[PDB]
Amino acid sequence: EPRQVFQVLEEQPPGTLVGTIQTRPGFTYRLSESHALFAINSSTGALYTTSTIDRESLPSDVINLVVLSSAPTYPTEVRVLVRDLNDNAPVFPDPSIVVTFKEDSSSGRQVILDTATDSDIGSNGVDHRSYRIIRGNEAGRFRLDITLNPSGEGAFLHLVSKGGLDREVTPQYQLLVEVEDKGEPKRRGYLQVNVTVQDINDNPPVFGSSHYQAGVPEDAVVGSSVLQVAAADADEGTNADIRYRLQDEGTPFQMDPETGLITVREPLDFEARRQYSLTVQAMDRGVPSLTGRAEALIQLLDVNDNDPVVKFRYFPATSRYASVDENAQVGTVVALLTVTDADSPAANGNISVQILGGNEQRHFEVQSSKVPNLSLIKVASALDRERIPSYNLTVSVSDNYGAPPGAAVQARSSVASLVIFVND
Amino acid sequence: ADPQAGSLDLQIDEEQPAGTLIGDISAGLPAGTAAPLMYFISAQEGSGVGTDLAIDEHSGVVRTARVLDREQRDRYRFTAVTPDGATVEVTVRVADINDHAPAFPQARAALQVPEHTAFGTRYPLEPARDADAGRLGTQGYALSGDGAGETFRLETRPGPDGTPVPELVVTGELDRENRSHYMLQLEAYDGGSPPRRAQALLDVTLLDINDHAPAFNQSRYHAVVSESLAPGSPVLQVFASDADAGVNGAVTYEINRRQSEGDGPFSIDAHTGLLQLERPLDFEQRRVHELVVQARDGGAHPELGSAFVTVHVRDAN
Ligand SMILES: *[C@@H]1O[C@H](CO[C@@H]2O[C@@H](C)[C@@H](O)[C@@H](O)[C@@H]2O)[C@@H](O[C@@H]2O[C@H](CO)[C@@H](O[C@@H]3O[C@H](CO)[C@@H](O)[C@H](O[C@H]4O[C@H](CO)[C@@H](O)[C@H](O)[C@@H]4O)[C@@H]3O)[C@H](O)[C@H]2NC(C)=O)[C@H](O[C@@H]2O[C@@H](C)[C@@H](O)[C@@H](O)[C@@H]2O)[C@H]1NC(C)=O
Ligand SMILES: *[C@@H]1O[C@H](CO[C@@H]2O[C@@H](C)[C@@H](O)[C@@H](O)[C@@H]2O)[C@@H](O[C@@H]2O[C@H](CO)[C@@H](O)[C@H](O)[C@H]2NC(C)=O)[C@H](O)[C@H]1NC(C)=O
Ligand SMILES: *[C@@H]1O[C@H](CO)[C@@H](O[C@@H]2O[C@H](CO)[C@@H](O)[C@H](O)[C@H]2NC(C)=O)[C@H](O)[C@H]1NC(C)=O
Ligand SMILES: *[C@@H]1O[C@H](CO)[C@@H](O[C@@H]2O[C@H](CO)[C@@H](O)[C@H](O)[C@H]2NC(C)=O)[C@H](O)[C@H]1NC(C)=O
Ligand SMILES: *[C@@H]1O[C@H](CO)[C@@H](O)[C@H](O)[C@H]1NC(C)=O
Ligand SMILES: C[As](C)(=O)[O-]
Ligand SMILES: C[As](C)(=O)[O-]
Ligand SMILES: C[As](C)(=O)[O-]
Ligand SMILES: [Ca+2]
Ligand SMILES: [Ca+2]
Ligand SMILES: [Ca+2]
Ligand SMILES: [Ca+2]
Ligand SMILES: [Ca+2]
Ligand SMILES: [Ca+2]
Ligand SMILES: [Ca+2]
Ligand SMILES: [Ca+2]
Ligand SMILES: [Ca+2]
Ligand SMILES: [Ca+2]
Ligand SMILES: [Ca+2]
Ligand SMILES: [Ca+2]
Ligand SMILES: [Ca+2]
Ligand SMILES: [Ca+2]
Ligand SMILES: [Ca+2]
Ligand SMILES: [Ca+2]
Ligand SMILES: [Ca+2]
Ligand SMILES: [Ca+2]
Ligand SMILES: [Ca+2]
């Protein structure tokens, strides 16, 4: 019939006094069963612990025993309450976690964190109102938001951005979060929160120079390198991967999209086009892609790649032979000698015409006029068809005439013949 | 000052009939010269003198052998030589007429510009071609229409030859969730006595960026069910929306499996937001389930929204 109630603190030395049952004169007392935790003094009815009890280790902190008497037996039901100490701290599921905000997230964007638990009874358990940022928030970019579940079961913690995150200034934060329990000596737990700031494509590529400049000889072979451009992009990953391109796609140059090297793809020709002022673009691989631009001035350098040519001009122009009457006075123009060389005066040097046989009798002469590249072929002496009816004059023309040995420019040359019949 | 070597500068308008008069070589001789019997003509190969000009080698009169195009060739030079060896160096300059109006490659151009593009971003526009020279070529531009002036301005900076090339410059804020289409008109003109002109329509459309996150229509949802509720049956439907377009605004749903409490028996339809029961409940093991449901869009780096869901489970009897 009778029932008594004792309490004992956990974590106490073996042999701690639990309680003493209310005895009756002339009885002794034993436990009805052997108990792992307790033992009874049979003459006093005092109950003692046999080991150090861990309340967190028990299936139940209420234990039910039955004390039995000697003599004519009666039973005594005992209830032992194992009382809790605040000997566990609040703990997080992981000592450290990682969370991510996008740079240029709006003020008030949040991301969820972990909450703590505590293995003591609820009155020594986590105070879910106490979560606090204690280190790492020097810049004042963050605050905590706590949500206590209205049903009384548990809580949720969130980290809230106050806006103004810029990955290119601060890509990483490390916050320390402290939570308290509610126990006699207050205990604390801690969570390290690593904050990654995720990159957006907010920076465009930028060329190292806004004006490039290259010089290229017109005989540069295909595949040869012309000018290397390079841009930088202050973002990360794909957002800063740059592809280069020329704006005008109809030139004889070529831009490798990944290296920014401009090479020659089609043969150049100074005589056709001396210089190309081109716009180069650099484009990142972000979505919203962004673009930078620069200017590139490629001047071609003239090469001596054209022979000088001599043409004769004379009065049956539809014929391949000139004619001169035997009666023509000394000084009569018989033909013009015009030189054409498509290169520029730099690559050409001096151009000179020289007579290569045919005029052994000195009946004609070749005379430079006062106009560049035109000579006159005149009658120099009396003629008569009976002695000589025809002549064949051969002239050679040459650019870079009189150049010293070891000069950088090789001279080019051609020959031309003019035959002259005498009429009467 | 040397009678033996003179020069003559002649001029002729392009696009005149073949046979048109240009000038007379004898005008370049010293005054009082006996008219020569004939002239020798020297021109360099490639000069076009033989094909485009008709020179009377007896009289010295120069005409056009054909209709001359300044845009093709603007200058001829040759030397005339008398039979006794005096020279006249003559140049003919072909005068430019305004036989070309400015011309855009398209009457309707379409430009895509991302919403919220940074102030001062420049978009080069196709020029109006005009083959004529100097003031006769394209001189300027004018932009009209909605946003012209406040949201977009037109600017020209000379490229090669000083040919002005136009660029459209972002000067105001662009928001695709306010106004996503701009109809602009671009005008061009050369510098004739009455300028010749071209018009082109420019359709600017804003590309959507992922600047909204999904938002639930309640911050917390509640459902109340019997612990006898059969698996496979619905429990509750949540709803989030996203103001962007396309993938950026395409919302899907999941349950957060780390921070939820009482997580296992439930799943949610990734596209409809319907939470359903997957395994039987048990009032005596858990009376209340606290879940967090999440919405993500389809953006390149998805943006996220979440809401609380409290499920109250009632005992059978
Ligand atoms: C006026 O003189 C010209 C200059 O000749 C030089 O000077 C004379 C005085 C003399 O010293 C010659 O020995 C000099 O070369 C003459 O023009 C030259 O003619 C020669 C002969 O044909 C030309 O040579 C050939 O050129 C051809 C075209 O370029 C080549 O195909 C050829 O090479 C191959 O082919 C032949 C046949 O298949 C073979 O015999 C060769 O061995 C080789 O396999 C020759 O190289 C030379 O190019 C000419 N030089 C100039 C500056 O033009 C000219 O002769 C007239 O024209 C030539 C083309 C022939 O039709 C002659 O019969 C013709 O007379 C002189 N004019 C006269 C004499 O009226
Ligand atoms: C949270 O961050 C810490 C510290 O990260 C360091 O600093 C960063 C700015 C970056 O430069 C990292 O590379 C650095 O390691 C992490 O602590 C490190 O963890 C690794 C592996 O766990 C360990 O080898 C190192 O010794 C730790 N460094 C220090 C200083 O303790 C921690 O792991 C991060 N948490 C998570 C969940 O990733
Ligand atoms: C049960 O408790 C009694 C009382 O303490 C123990 O009996 C004796 O008690 C006196 C003082 O009351 C001590 O001076 C003696 O030393 C105790 N005897 C012994 C043998 O220790 C009794 O021993 C206890 N029973 C057990 C099993 O320990
Ligand atoms: C959130 O959205 C749902 C779905 O639209 C709403 O549920 C509706 O609620 C109205 C009354 O508010 C009822 O008339 C409808 O029958 C409900 N279902 C549907 C499919 O519309 C819910 O009310 C919304 N929550 C809030 C706070 O407005
Ligand atoms: C949308 O843009 C117009 C101007 O085009 C502006 O007047 C209006 O305030 C904007 N709407 C909102 C909701 O901001
Ligand atoms: C008259 As202009 C366009 O060549 O400066
Ligand atoms: C896992 As099922 C078929 O109950 O939705
Ligand atoms: C449910 As909420 C508005 O705290 O993300
Ligand atoms: Ca303990
Ligand atoms: Ca304890
Ligand atoms: Ca505790
Ligand atoms: Ca986490
Ligand atoms: Ca930034
Ligand atoms: Ca960035
Ligand atoms: Ca970038
Ligand atoms: Ca970087
Ligand atoms: Ca060349
Ligand atoms: Ca050359
Ligand atoms: Ca040459
Ligand atoms: Ca002279
Ligand atoms: Ca024309
Ligand atoms: Ca024009
Ligand atoms: Ca013209
Ligand atoms: Ca927007
Ligand atoms: Ca958007
Ligand atoms: Ca979105
Ligand atoms: Ca039940």
Side-chain angles (χ1 to χ4, degrees), chain A residues 102 109 198, chain B residues 210 212-214 242 247-248 250 252 295-305:
Chain A
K102 284 197 203 176
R109 291 287 289 146
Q198 189 151 89
Chain B
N210 185 24
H212 294 83
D242 193 303
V247 293
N248 285 338
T252 58
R296 57 177 60 248
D297 57 30
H301 290 77
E303 260 301 7
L304 214 50

mmCIF file of all heavy atoms in Angstrom, chain A residues 102 109 198, chain B residues 210 212-214 242 247-248 250 252 295-305:
data_model
loop_
_atom_site.group_PDB
_atom_site.id
_atom_site.type_symbol
_atom_site.label_atom_id
_atom_site.label_comp_id
_atom_site.label_asym_id
_atom_site.label_seq_id
_atom_site.Cartn_x
_atom_site.Cartn_y
_atom_site.Cartn_z
ATOM 1 N N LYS A 102 24.501 36.313 -52.773
ATOM 2 C CA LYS A 102 24.909 36.959 -54.015
ATOM 3 C C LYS A 102 25.317 38.389 -53.729
ATOM 4 O O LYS A 102 24.634 39.097 -52.987
ATOM 5 C CB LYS A 102 23.769 36.990 -55.026
ATOM 6 C CG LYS A 102 23.482 35.684 -55.729
ATOM 7 C CD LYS A 102 22.638 35.965 -56.963
ATOM 8 C CE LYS A 102 21.849 34.760 -57.427
ATOM 9 N NZ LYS A 102 20.978 35.165 -58.584
ATOM 10 N N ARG A 109 17.703 40.138 -47.621
ATOM 11 C CA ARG A 109 17.836 38.752 -48.048
ATOM 12 C C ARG A 109 18.462 37.931 -46.938
ATOM 13 O O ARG A 109 19.352 38.396 -46.229
ATOM 14 C CB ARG A 109 18.644 38.649 -49.340
ATOM 15 C CG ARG A 109 17.875 39.231 -50.528
ATOM 16 C CD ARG A 109 16.718 38.329 -50.978
ATOM 17 N NE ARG A 109 17.188 37.113 -51.632
ATOM 18 C CZ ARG A 109 16.590 35.924 -51.551
ATOM 19 N NH1 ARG A 109 15.469 35.784 -50.848
ATOM 20 N NH2 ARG A 109 17.108 34.880 -52.199
ATOM 21 N N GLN A 198 28.792 35.383 -53.456
ATOM 22 C CA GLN A 198 28.837 34.838 -54.804
ATOM 23 C C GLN A 198 28.960 35.951 -55.841
ATOM 24 O O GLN A 198 28.383 37.030 -55.691
ATOM 25 C CB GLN A 198 27.602 33.994 -55.080
ATOM 26 C CG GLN A 198 27.658 33.216 -56.392
ATOM 27 C CD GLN A 198 26.860 31.938 -56.311
ATOM 28 O OE1 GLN A 198 25.662 31.921 -56.599
ATOM 29 N NE2 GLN A 198 27.510 30.860 -55.875
ATOM 30 N N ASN B 210 17.884 38.255 -63.721
ATOM 31 C CA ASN B 210 17.231 37.523 -62.629
ATOM 32 C C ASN B 210 17.307 38.325 -61.334
ATOM 33 O O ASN B 210 18.027 37.987 -60.397
ATOM 34 C CB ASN B 210 17.862 36.151 -62.450
ATOM 35 C CG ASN B 210 17.143 35.310 -61.413
ATOM 36 O OD1 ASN B 210 15.963 35.527 -61.146
ATOM 37 N ND2 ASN B 210 17.843 34.334 -60.838
ATOM 38 N N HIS B 212 14.636 39.173 -59.290
ATOM 39 C CA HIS B 212 13.563 38.919 -58.347
ATOM 40 C C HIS B 212 13.722 37.517 -57.816
ATOM 41 O O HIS B 212 14.106 36.609 -58.559
ATOM 42 C CB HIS B 212 12.183 39.058 -58.993
ATOM 43 C CG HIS B 212 11.868 40.451 -59.415
ATOM 44 N ND1 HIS B 212 12.298 40.978 -60.612
ATOM 45 C CD2 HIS B 212 11.215 41.450 -58.777
ATOM 46 C CE1 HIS B 212 11.907 42.235 -60.705
ATOM 47 N NE2 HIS B 212 11.248 42.546 -59.604
ATOM 48 N N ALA B 213 13.412 37.338 -56.565
ATOM 49 C CA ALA B 213 13.426 35.975 -56.061
ATOM 50 C C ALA B 213 11.998 35.487 -55.820
ATOM 51 O O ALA B 213 11.098 36.305 -55.595
ATOM 52 C CB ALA B 213 14.220 35.876 -54.750
ATOM 53 N N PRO B 214 11.751 34.168 -55.864
ATOM 54 C CA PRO B 214 10.405 33.665 -55.538
ATOM 55 C C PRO B 214 10.012 34.055 -54.123
ATOM 56 O O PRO B 214 10.830 34.018 -53.207
ATOM 57 C CB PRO B 214 10.544 32.145 -55.668
ATOM 58 C CG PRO B 214 11.759 31.927 -56.547
ATOM 59 C CD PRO B 214 12.679 33.077 -56.227
ATOM 60 N N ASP B 242 7.304 34.591 -58.974
ATOM 61 C CA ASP B 242 8.570 35.198 -59.349
ATOM 62 C C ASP B 242 8.321 36.134 -60.524
ATOM 63 O O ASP B 242 7.801 35.708 -61.556
ATOM 64 C CB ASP B 242 9.594 34.115 -59.711
ATOM 65 C CG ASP B 242 11.034 34.662 -59.804
ATOM 66 O OD1 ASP B 242 11.311 35.614 -60.591
ATOM 67 O OD2 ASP B 242 11.885 34.123 -59.072
ATOM 68 N N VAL B 247 13.149 31.267 -67.766
ATOM 69 C CA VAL B 247 13.735 30.419 -66.732
ATOM 70 C C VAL B 247 13.920 31.206 -65.431
ATOM 71 O O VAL B 247 13.632 30.704 -64.341
ATOM 72 C CB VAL B 247 15.052 29.803 -67.249
ATOM 73 C CG1 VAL B 247 14.771 28.813 -68.386
ATOM 74 C CG2 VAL B 247 15.977 30.887 -67.752
ATOM 75 N N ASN B 248 14.316 32.475 -65.541
ATOM 76 C CA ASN B 248 14.500 33.333 -64.385
ATOM 77 C C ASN B 248 13.261 33.402 -63.511
ATOM 78 O O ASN B 248 13.384 33.683 -62.317
ATOM 79 C CB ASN B 248 14.887 34.740 -64.840
ATOM 80 C CG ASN B 248 16.326 34.836 -65.316
ATOM 81 O OD1 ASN B 248 17.150 34.015 -64.951
ATOM 82 N ND2 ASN B 248 16.622 35.835 -66.155
ATOM 83 N N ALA B 250 10.735 30.801 -63.398
ATOM 84 C CA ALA B 250 10.107 29.484 -63.384
ATOM 85 C C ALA B 250 10.371 28.810 -62.035
ATOM 86 O O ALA B 250 11.476 28.318 -61.771
ATOM 87 C CB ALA B 250 10.641 28.633 -64.537
ATOM 88 N N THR B 252 10.363 26.318 -58.896
ATOM 89 C CA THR B 252 10.182 24.943 -58.443
ATOM 90 C C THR B 252 10.273 24.859 -56.914
ATOM 91 O O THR B 252 10.774 25.775 -56.247
ATOM 92 C CB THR B 252 11.187 24.004 -59.130
ATOM 93 O OG1 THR B 252 12.529 24.441 -58.873
ATOM 94 C CG2 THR B 252 10.952 24.010 -60.647
ATOM 95 N N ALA B 295 11.412 27.595 -52.486
ATOM 96 C CA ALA B 295 11.156 27.832 -53.902
ATOM 97 C C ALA B 295 12.432 28.338 -54.545
ATOM 98 O O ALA B 295 13.075 29.246 -54.008
ATOM 99 C CB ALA B 295 10.060 28.862 -54.104
ATOM 100 N N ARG B 296 12.802 27.762 -55.673
ATOM 101 C CA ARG B 296 13.925 28.294 -56.445
ATOM 102 C C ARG B 296 13.463 28.553 -57.875
ATOM 103 O O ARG B 296 12.588 27.845 -58.388
ATOM 104 C CB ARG B 296 15.125 27.330 -56.438
ATOM 105 C CG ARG B 296 14.759 25.966 -56.956
ATOM 106 C CD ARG B 296 15.943 25.057 -57.001
ATOM 107 N NE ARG B 296 16.518 24.877 -55.680
ATOM 108 C CZ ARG B 296 17.710 25.337 -55.329
ATOM 109 N NH1 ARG B 296 18.459 25.990 -56.213
ATOM 110 N NH2 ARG B 296 18.156 25.130 -54.098
ATOM 111 N N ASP B 297 14.046 29.567 -58.519
ATOM 112 C CA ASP B 297 13.770 29.766 -59.938
ATOM 113 C C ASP B 297 14.787 28.995 -60.786
ATOM 114 O O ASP B 297 15.592 28.193 -60.289
ATOM 115 C CB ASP B 297 13.700 31.261 -60.288
ATOM 116 C CG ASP B 297 14.953 32.032 -59.919
ATOM 117 O OD1 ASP B 297 16.051 31.432 -59.927
ATOM 118 O OD2 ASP B 297 14.839 33.265 -59.655
ATOM 119 N N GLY B 298 14.734 29.201 -62.094
ATOM 120 C CA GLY B 298 15.586 28.484 -63.018
ATOM 121 C C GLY B 298 16.808 29.263 -63.434
ATOM 122 O O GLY B 298 17.500 28.844 -64.368
ATOM 123 N N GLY B 299 17.093 30.384 -62.765
ATOM 124 C CA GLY B 299 18.169 31.266 -63.182
ATOM 125 C C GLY B 299 19.534 30.602 -63.123
ATOM 126 O O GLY B 299 19.720 29.539 -62.526
ATOM 127 N N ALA B 300 20.506 31.266 -63.757
ATOM 128 C CA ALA B 300 21.847 30.704 -63.885
ATOM 129 C C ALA B 300 22.420 30.354 -62.517
ATOM 130 O O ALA B 300 22.968 29.262 -62.318
ATOM 131 C CB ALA B 300 22.755 31.693 -64.625
ATOM 132 N N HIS B 301 22.298 31.271 -61.560
ATOM 133 C CA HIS B 301 22.480 30.958 -60.143
ATOM 134 C C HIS B 301 21.133 31.215 -59.496
ATOM 135 O O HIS B 301 20.741 32.382 -59.325
ATOM 136 C CB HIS B 301 23.600 31.785 -59.514
ATOM 137 C CG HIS B 301 24.961 31.387 -59.990
ATOM 138 N ND1 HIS B 301 25.448 31.752 -61.227
ATOM 139 C CD2 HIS B 301 25.898 30.580 -59.437
ATOM 140 C CE1 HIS B 301 26.642 31.217 -61.399
ATOM 141 N NE2 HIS B 301 26.938 30.500 -60.329
ATOM 142 N N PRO B 302 20.361 30.172 -59.196
ATOM 143 C CA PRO B 302 18.970 30.378 -58.807
ATOM 144 C C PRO B 302 18.876 31.205 -57.542
ATOM 145 O O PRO B 302 19.729 31.129 -56.653
ATOM 146 C CB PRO B 302 18.440 28.958 -58.608
ATOM 147 C CG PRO B 302 19.309 28.111 -59.462
ATOM 148 C CD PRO B 302 20.668 28.743 -59.326
ATOM 149 N N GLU B 303 17.859 32.046 -57.505
ATOM 150 C CA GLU B 303 17.495 32.782 -56.311
ATOM 151 C C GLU B 303 16.401 32.004 -55.567
ATOM 152 O O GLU B 303 15.632 31.243 -56.173
ATOM 153 C CB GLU B 303 17.056 34.210 -56.672
ATOM 154 C CG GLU B 303 18.146 35.268 -56.454
ATOM 155 C CD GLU B 303 18.653 35.353 -54.993
ATOM 156 O OE1 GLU B 303 18.278 34.508 -54.142
ATOM 157 O OE2 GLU B 303 19.446 36.280 -54.691
ATOM 158 N N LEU B 304 16.364 32.174 -54.237
ATOM 159 C CA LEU B 304 15.660 31.265 -53.332
ATOM 160 C C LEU B 304 14.672 32.002 -52.440
ATOM 161 O O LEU B 304 14.965 33.085 -51.929
ATOM 162 C CB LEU B 304 16.640 30.521 -52.441
ATOM 163 C CG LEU B 304 16.301 29.097 -52.052
ATOM 164 C CD1 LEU B 304 15.963 28.358 -53.283
ATOM 165 C CD2 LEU B 304 17.486 28.449 -51.417
ATOM 166 N N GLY B 305 13.502 31.394 -52.252
ATOM 167 C CA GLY B 305 12.563 31.835 -51.249
ATOM 168 C C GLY B 305 12.129 30.642 -50.423
ATOM 169 O O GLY B 305 12.272 29.488 -50.836
#
